[PDB]
Amino acid sequence: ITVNVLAWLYAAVINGDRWFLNRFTTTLNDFNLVAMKYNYEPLTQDHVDILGPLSAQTGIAVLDMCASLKELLQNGMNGRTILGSALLEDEFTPFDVVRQCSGVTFQ
């Protein structure tokens, strides 16, 4: 669940992991092509809008998250770990990330 992954990445930013960021950018269309290859679910604008608040927090564009993700997928993590995991974590929903890492969330 890419949508979970992006949230997790946002958590990573909150947690101060930063090496995995890059200064590149991507398009949703381009991203989805890469995702499809790797049997990742596509990111839709719906989930962009889900991730909007998280983008607000971290100042990182969703597409920029996608781009950095793209590099991560293509080249792998190169033995590196993120949040002490050697595996890209897709277990955490955006809501969970938001709950833990945005303090009090308004409705």
- The method recorded for this entry reads NMR
Q: In angstroms, what CA-CA distances link 69 with 62, 99, 100, 102, 106?
A: 10, 23, 22, 22, 29
Please check whether residue 22 is in contact with residue 66, taking contact to mean a CB–CB distance below 8 angstroms: no
Please check whether residue 6 is in contact with residue 51, taking contact to mean a CB–CB distance below 8 angstroms: yes
Cβ neighbours of residue 79 under 8 Å, at least 6 residues apart? none
Among 11, 18, 15, which Cα is nearest to 97's? 11
DSSP class of 67 = H
- CATH node for 2-93: 1.10.1840.10
CA–CA separation, 8 and 101 (whole Å): 11
Burial class (CB in 10 A: 0-12, 13-18, 19+), 106: exposed
Domain spans of the chain, in order of start: 2-93
DSSP conformation letters of 6-65: HHHHHHHHHHT--TT--S----HHHHHHHHHHTTPPPP-HHHHHHHHHHHHHHT--HHHH
CA–CA separation, 55 and 22 (whole Å): 16
